[PDB]
Amino acid sequence: GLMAQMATTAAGVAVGSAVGHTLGHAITGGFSG
Amino acid sequence: GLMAQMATTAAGVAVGSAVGHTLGHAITGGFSG
Amino acid sequence: GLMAQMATTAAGVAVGSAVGHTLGHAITGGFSG
Amino acid sequence: GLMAQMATTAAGVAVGSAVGHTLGHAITGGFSG
Amino acid sequence: GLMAQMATTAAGVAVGSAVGHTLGHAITGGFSG
Amino acid sequence: GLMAQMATTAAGVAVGSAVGHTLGHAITGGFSG
């Protein structure tokens, strides 16, 4: 599926393998004034 | 599925393998003034 | 499923393997003034 | 410094604000066979 | 410094604000056979 | 400094604001057979 070999010295965010998914109905609110 | 081999020295956030998912109905509120 | 081999020296947050999911109906409140 | 306002429904890993740092001497071992 | 306003429904990894830094001497091992 | 307003429905990795830096001496190992 997902494979990662990572060598990092400094990182704000370090991620090897990651999945995000929505099935069905998903609603994300936006930005309003 | 998900495999990660990570070598890191400094990280704000370090994650090997991660999954986030919604099934069915998901509503996220936004930002309003 | 999820496998992680991580070597880290300093991390704000270090996570090997993690899953978060919602099934059915999920509502997250947003930010309002 | 670091400020975060996050609305999330499902996440493997959810982090608002995070710092990781090394001062001086830091050695991270790698992967060998 | 760092500011984030994030609305997300599904994420493998969700991070608002993050810093990773090394000061001085940092050595990260690599991958060898 | 860094500001982010992000609306996302599905993401493998979602990051608002992030900084990674090395000061001084940093060595990252590579990949060898």
PDB file of C-alpha atoms in Angstrom:
ATOM      1  CA  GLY A   1       0.000   0.000   0.000  1.00  0.00           C
ATOM      2  CA  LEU A   2       2.024   2.916   1.357  1.00  0.00           C
ATOM      3  CA  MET A   3       5.706   2.526   2.206  1.00  0.00           C
ATOM      4  CA  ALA A   4       8.131   5.230   3.303  1.00  0.00           C
ATOM      5  CA  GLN A   5      11.776   5.205   4.370  1.00  0.00           C
ATOM      6  CA  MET A   6      12.608   8.725   5.529  1.00  0.00           C
ATOM      7  CA  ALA A   7      15.734  10.189   7.082  1.00  0.00           C
ATOM      8  CA  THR A   8      15.210  13.741   8.311  1.00  0.00           C
ATOM      9  CA  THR A   9      17.210  16.010  10.578  1.00  0.00           C
ATOM     10  CA  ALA A  10      14.770  18.819  11.361  1.00  0.00           C
ATOM     11  CA  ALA A  11      11.128  19.008  10.349  1.00  0.00           C
ATOM     12  CA  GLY A  12       8.119  20.970  11.474  1.00  0.00           C
ATOM     13  CA  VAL A  13       6.010  17.935  10.590  1.00  0.00           C
ATOM     14  CA  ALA A  14       7.391  14.561   9.505  1.00  0.00           C
ATOM     15  CA  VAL A  15       4.998  11.836   8.378  1.00  0.00           C
ATOM     16  CA  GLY A  16       5.853   8.459   6.917  1.00  0.00           C
ATOM     17  CA  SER A  17       2.568   7.137   5.545  1.00  0.00           C
ATOM     18  CA  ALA A  18      -0.866   8.666   5.989  1.00  0.00           C
ATOM     19  CA  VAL A  19      -4.371   8.255   4.596  1.00  0.00           C
ATOM     20  CA  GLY A  20      -7.396  10.455   5.078  1.00  0.00           C
ATOM     21  CA  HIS A  21     -10.692   9.688   3.404  1.00  0.00           C
ATOM     22  CA  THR A  22     -14.410  10.365   3.685  1.00  0.00           C
ATOM     23  CA  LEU A  23     -17.071   7.892   2.589  1.00  0.00           C
ATOM     24  CA  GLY A  24     -20.699   8.905   2.208  1.00  0.00           C
ATOM     25  CA  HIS A  25     -21.428  12.552   2.997  1.00  0.00           C
ATOM     26  CA  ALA A  26     -18.888  15.044   4.296  1.00  0.00           C
ATOM     27  CA  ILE A  27     -19.387  18.772   4.822  1.00  0.00           C
ATOM     28  CA  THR A  28     -16.603  21.122   5.876  1.00  0.00           C
ATOM     29  CA  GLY A  29     -17.479  24.608   7.041  1.00  0.00           C
ATOM     30  CA  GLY A  30     -15.646  27.520   5.476  1.00  0.00           C
ATOM     31  CA  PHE A  31     -14.641  30.952   6.722  1.00  0.00           C
ATOM     32  CA  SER A  32     -17.198  33.755   6.992  1.00  0.00           C
ATOM     33  CA  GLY A  33     -17.070  37.299   8.330  1.00  0.00           C
TER      34      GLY A  33
ATOM     35  CA  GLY B   1      -1.248  -1.441   4.433  1.00  0.00           C
ATOM     36  CA  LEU B   2       0.857   1.421   5.783  1.00  0.00           C
ATOM     37  CA  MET B   3       4.535   0.938   6.602  1.00  0.00           C
ATOM     38  CA  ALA B   4       7.034   3.579   7.688  1.00  0.00           C
ATOM     39  CA  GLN B   5      10.685   3.462   8.727  1.00  0.00           C
ATOM     40  CA  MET B   6      11.612   6.957   9.889  1.00  0.00           C
ATOM     41  CA  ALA B   7      14.784   8.339  11.422  1.00  0.00           C
ATOM     42  CA  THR B   8      14.357  11.899  12.665  1.00  0.00           C
ATOM     43  CA  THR B   9      16.428  14.112  14.923  1.00  0.00           C
ATOM     44  CA  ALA B  10      14.064  16.978  15.733  1.00  0.00           C
ATOM     45  CA  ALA B  11      10.420  17.258  14.750  1.00  0.00           C
ATOM     46  CA  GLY B  12       7.469  19.290  15.903  1.00  0.00           C
ATOM     47  CA  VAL B  13       5.279  16.311  15.026  1.00  0.00           C
ATOM     48  CA  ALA B  14       6.569  12.907  13.922  1.00  0.00           C
ATOM     49  CA  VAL B  15       4.102  10.244  12.806  1.00  0.00           C
ATOM     50  CA  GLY B  16       4.863   6.852  11.328  1.00  0.00           C
ATOM     51  CA  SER B  17       1.536   5.614   9.978  1.00  0.00           C
ATOM     52  CA  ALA B  18      -1.856   7.225  10.453  1.00  0.00           C
ATOM     53  CA  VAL B  19      -5.381   6.905   9.086  1.00  0.00           C
ATOM     54  CA  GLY B  20      -8.347   9.176   9.597  1.00  0.00           C
ATOM     55  CA  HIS B  21     -11.674   8.495   7.947  1.00  0.00           C
ATOM     56  CA  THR B  22     -15.372   9.261   8.259  1.00  0.00           C
ATOM     57  CA  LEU B  23     -18.100   6.857   7.176  1.00  0.00           C
ATOM     58  CA  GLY B  24     -21.706   7.960   6.826  1.00  0.00           C
ATOM     59  CA  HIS B  25     -22.339  11.621   7.631  1.00  0.00           C
ATOM     60  CA  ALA B  26     -19.730  14.047   8.917  1.00  0.00           C
ATOM     61  CA  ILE B  27     -20.133  17.784   9.458  1.00  0.00           C
ATOM     62  CA  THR B  28     -17.285  20.062  10.497  1.00  0.00           C
ATOM     63  CA  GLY B  29     -18.066  23.565  11.678  1.00  0.00           C
ATOM     64  CA  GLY B  30     -16.175  26.436  10.108  1.00  0.00           C
ATOM     65  CA  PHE B  31     -15.076  29.839  11.355  1.00  0.00           C
ATOM     66  CA  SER B  32     -17.562  32.703  11.653  1.00  0.00           C
ATOM     67  CA  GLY B  33     -17.337  36.238  13.000  1.00  0.00           C
TER      68      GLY B  33
ATOM     69  CA  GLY C   1      -2.389  -2.871   8.840  1.00  0.00           C
ATOM     70  CA  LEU C   2      -0.219  -0.055  10.185  1.00  0.00           C
ATOM     71  CA  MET C   3       3.454  -0.611  10.976  1.00  0.00           C
ATOM     72  CA  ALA C   4       6.011   1.977  12.053  1.00  0.00           C
ATOM     73  CA  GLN C   5       9.667   1.786  13.065  1.00  0.00           C
ATOM     74  CA  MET C   6      10.669   5.259  14.232  1.00  0.00           C
ATOM     75  CA  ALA C   7      13.878   6.574  15.747  1.00  0.00           C
ATOM     76  CA  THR C   8      13.528  10.138  17.005  1.00  0.00           C
ATOM     77  CA  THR C   9      15.658  12.302  19.255  1.00  0.00           C
ATOM     78  CA  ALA C  10      13.355  15.210  20.092  1.00  0.00           C
ATOM     79  CA  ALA C  11       9.711  15.564  19.136  1.00  0.00           C
ATOM     80  CA  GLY C  12       6.807  17.649  20.316  1.00  0.00           C
ATOM     81  CA  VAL C  13       4.554  14.715  19.446  1.00  0.00           C
ATOM     82  CA  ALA C  14       5.770  11.291  18.321  1.00  0.00           C
ATOM     83  CA  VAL C  15       3.244   8.680  17.213  1.00  0.00           C
ATOM     84  CA  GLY C  16       3.929   5.279  15.719  1.00  0.00           C
ATOM     85  CA  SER C  17       0.570   4.110  14.389  1.00  0.00           C
ATOM     86  CA  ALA C  18      -2.787   5.785  14.893  1.00  0.00           C
ATOM     87  CA  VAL C  19      -6.327   5.537  13.550  1.00  0.00           C
ATOM     88  CA  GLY C  20      -9.246   7.863  14.090  1.00  0.00           C
ATOM     89  CA  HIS C  21     -12.596   7.252  12.461  1.00  0.00           C
ATOM     90  CA  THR C  22     -16.277   8.088  12.802  1.00  0.00           C
ATOM     91  CA  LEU C  23     -19.058   5.741  11.731  1.00  0.00           C
ATOM     92  CA  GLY C  24     -22.644   6.914  11.410  1.00  0.00           C
ATOM     93  CA  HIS C  25     -23.201  10.584  12.232  1.00  0.00           C
ATOM     94  CA  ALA C  26     -20.536  12.955  13.507  1.00  0.00           C
ATOM     95  CA  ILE C  27     -20.863  16.697  14.064  1.00  0.00           C
ATOM     96  CA  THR C  28     -17.964  18.916  15.090  1.00  0.00           C
ATOM     97  CA  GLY C  29     -18.669  22.430  16.288  1.00  0.00           C
ATOM     98  CA  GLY C  30     -16.734  25.269  14.714  1.00  0.00           C
ATOM     99  CA  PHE C  31     -15.561  28.646  15.965  1.00  0.00           C
ATOM    100  CA  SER C  32     -17.989  31.556  16.290  1.00  0.00           C
ATOM    101  CA  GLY C  33     -17.687  35.082  17.647  1.00  0.00           C
TER     102      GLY C  33
ATOM    103  CA  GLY D   1       4.442  31.937  19.516  1.00  0.00           C
ATOM    104  CA  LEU D   2       2.304  29.104  18.157  1.00  0.00           C
ATOM    105  CA  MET D   3      -1.476  29.414  17.962  1.00  0.00           C
ATOM    106  CA  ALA D   4      -3.927  26.959  16.424  1.00  0.00           C
ATOM    107  CA  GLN D   5      -7.716  26.845  16.179  1.00  0.00           C
ATOM    108  CA  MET D   6      -8.619  23.489  14.647  1.00  0.00           C
ATOM    109  CA  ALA D   7     -11.963  21.838  14.001  1.00  0.00           C
ATOM    110  CA  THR D   8     -11.601  18.226  12.893  1.00  0.00           C
ATOM    111  CA  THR D   9     -14.044  15.356  12.607  1.00  0.00           C
ATOM    112  CA  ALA D  10     -11.779  12.332  12.174  1.00  0.00           C
ATOM    113  CA  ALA D  11      -8.000  12.284  12.360  1.00  0.00           C
ATOM    114  CA  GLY D  12      -5.362   9.646  12.859  1.00  0.00           C
ATOM    115  CA  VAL D  13      -3.299  12.278  14.665  1.00  0.00           C
ATOM    116  CA  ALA D  14      -4.506  15.781  15.525  1.00  0.00           C
ATOM    117  CA  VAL D  15      -2.078  18.276  17.044  1.00  0.00           C
ATOM    118  CA  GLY D  16      -2.669  21.933  17.778  1.00  0.00           C
ATOM    119  CA  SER D  17       0.779  23.343  18.518  1.00  0.00           C
ATOM    120  CA  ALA D  18       4.002  21.395  18.901  1.00  0.00           C
ATOM    121  CA  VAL D  19       7.729  22.067  19.132  1.00  0.00           C
ATOM    122  CA  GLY D  20      10.599  19.623  19.016  1.00  0.00           C
ATOM    123  CA  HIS D  21      14.190  20.773  19.197  1.00  0.00           C
ATOM    124  CA  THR D  22      17.673  19.556  20.062  1.00  0.00           C
ATOM    125  CA  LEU D  23      20.363  21.795  21.527  1.00  0.00           C
ATOM    126  CA  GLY D  24      23.991  20.721  21.671  1.00  0.00           C
ATOM    127  CA  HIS D  25      24.691  17.270  20.239  1.00  0.00           C
ATOM    128  CA  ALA D  26      22.054  14.877  18.947  1.00  0.00           C
ATOM    129  CA  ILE D  27      22.623  11.551  17.206  1.00  0.00           C
ATOM    130  CA  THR D  28      19.821   9.451  15.749  1.00  0.00           C
ATOM    131  CA  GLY D  29      20.531   5.881  14.735  1.00  0.00           C
ATOM    132  CA  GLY D  30      19.486   4.772  11.276  1.00  0.00           C
ATOM    133  CA  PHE D  31      18.385   1.457   9.813  1.00  0.00           C
ATOM    134  CA  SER D  32      20.920  -1.271   9.038  1.00  0.00           C
ATOM    135  CA  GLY D  33      20.629  -4.851   7.827  1.00  0.00           C
TER     136      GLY D  33
ATOM    137  CA  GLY E   1       4.783  33.592  15.019  1.00  0.00           C
ATOM    138  CA  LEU E   2       2.724  30.703  13.655  1.00  0.00           C
ATOM    139  CA  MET E   3      -1.061  30.924  13.425  1.00  0.00           C
ATOM    140  CA  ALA E   4      -3.440  28.406  11.878  1.00  0.00           C
ATOM    141  CA  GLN E   5      -7.223  28.203  11.600  1.00  0.00           C
ATOM    142  CA  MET E   6      -8.035  24.819  10.077  1.00  0.00           C
ATOM    143  CA  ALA E   7     -11.333  23.087   9.411  1.00  0.00           C
ATOM    144  CA  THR E   8     -10.878  19.480   8.323  1.00  0.00           C
ATOM    145  CA  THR E   9     -13.250  16.552   8.030  1.00  0.00           C
ATOM    146  CA  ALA E  10     -10.912  13.580   7.632  1.00  0.00           C
ATOM    147  CA  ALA E  11      -7.135  13.621   7.852  1.00  0.00           C
ATOM    148  CA  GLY E  12      -4.441  11.047   8.387  1.00  0.00           C
ATOM    149  CA  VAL E  13      -2.456  13.735  10.197  1.00  0.00           C
ATOM    150  CA  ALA E  14      -3.751  17.214  11.029  1.00  0.00           C
ATOM    151  CA  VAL E  15      -1.396  19.771  12.557  1.00  0.00           C
ATOM    152  CA  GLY E  16      -2.078  23.417  13.268  1.00  0.00           C
ATOM    153  CA  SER E  17       1.330  24.910  14.031  1.00  0.00           C
ATOM    154  CA  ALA E  18       4.593  23.040  14.452  1.00  0.00           C
ATOM    155  CA  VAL E  19       8.302  23.799  14.713  1.00  0.00           C
ATOM    156  CA  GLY E  20      11.229  21.422  14.634  1.00  0.00           C
ATOM    157  CA  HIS E  21      14.791  22.657  14.841  1.00  0.00           C
ATOM    158  CA  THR E  22      18.293  21.525  15.743  1.00  0.00           C
ATOM    159  CA  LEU E  23      20.917  23.834  17.220  1.00  0.00           C
ATOM    160  CA  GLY E  24      24.568  22.845  17.401  1.00  0.00           C
ATOM    161  CA  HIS E  25      25.360  19.404  15.993  1.00  0.00           C
ATOM    162  CA  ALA E  26      22.791  16.944  14.690  1.00  0.00           C
ATOM    163  CA  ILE E  27      23.452  13.624  12.970  1.00  0.00           C
ATOM    164  CA  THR E  28      20.713  11.452  11.499  1.00  0.00           C
ATOM    165  CA  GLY E  29      21.515   7.895  10.509  1.00  0.00           C
ATOM    166  CA  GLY E  30      20.527   6.746   7.046  1.00  0.00           C
ATOM    167  CA  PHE E  31      19.516   3.399   5.590  1.00  0.00           C
ATOM    168  CA  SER E  32      22.120   0.727   4.852  1.00  0.00           C
ATOM    169  CA  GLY E  33      21.924  -2.864   3.656  1.00  0.00           C
TER     170      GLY E  33
ATOM    171  CA  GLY F   1       5.098  35.178  10.512  1.00  0.00           C
ATOM    172  CA  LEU F   2       3.119  32.237   9.144  1.00  0.00           C
ATOM    173  CA  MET F   3      -0.668  32.368   8.883  1.00  0.00           C
ATOM    174  CA  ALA F   4      -2.975  29.789   7.328  1.00  0.00           C
ATOM    175  CA  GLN F   5      -6.750  29.496   7.019  1.00  0.00           C
ATOM    176  CA  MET F   6      -7.470  26.087   5.506  1.00  0.00           C
ATOM    177  CA  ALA F   7     -10.721  24.276   4.820  1.00  0.00           C
ATOM    178  CA  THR F   8     -10.173  20.676   3.752  1.00  0.00           C
ATOM    179  CA  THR F   9     -12.474  17.692   3.453  1.00  0.00           C
ATOM    180  CA  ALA F  10     -10.064  14.774   3.087  1.00  0.00           C
ATOM    181  CA  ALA F  11      -6.291  14.904   3.337  1.00  0.00           C
ATOM    182  CA  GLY F  12      -3.542  12.396   3.906  1.00  0.00           C
ATOM    183  CA  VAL F  13      -1.635  15.137   5.721  1.00  0.00           C
ATOM    184  CA  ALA F  14      -3.018  18.588   6.527  1.00  0.00           C
ATOM    185  CA  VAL F  15      -0.735  21.206   8.062  1.00  0.00           C
ATOM    186  CA  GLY F  16      -1.508  24.839   8.751  1.00  0.00           C
ATOM    187  CA  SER F  17       1.857  26.414   9.535  1.00  0.00           C
ATOM    188  CA  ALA F  18       5.160  24.622   9.991  1.00  0.00           C
ATOM    189  CA  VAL F  19       8.847  25.469  10.278  1.00  0.00           C
ATOM    190  CA  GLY F  20      11.829  23.161  10.235  1.00  0.00           C
ATOM    191  CA  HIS F  21      15.360  24.479  10.465  1.00  0.00           C
ATOM    192  CA  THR F  22      18.880  23.434  11.400  1.00  0.00           C
ATOM    193  CA  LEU F  23      21.437  25.809  12.889  1.00  0.00           C
ATOM    194  CA  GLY F  24      25.108  24.907  13.104  1.00  0.00           C
ATOM    195  CA  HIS F  25      25.992  21.479  11.718  1.00  0.00           C
ATOM    196  CA  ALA F  26      23.492  18.955  10.405  1.00  0.00           C
ATOM    197  CA  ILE F  27      24.245  15.643   8.705  1.00  0.00           C
ATOM    198  CA  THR F  28      21.569  13.402   7.222  1.00  0.00           C
ATOM    199  CA  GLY F  29      22.462   9.860   6.254  1.00  0.00           C
ATOM    200  CA  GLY F  30      21.529   8.673   2.789  1.00  0.00           C
ATOM    201  CA  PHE F  31      20.609   5.297   1.340  1.00  0.00           C
ATOM    202  CA  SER F  32      23.281   2.684   0.634  1.00  0.00           C
ATOM    203  CA  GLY F  33      23.178  -0.916  -0.546  1.00  0.00           C
TER     204      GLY F  33
END
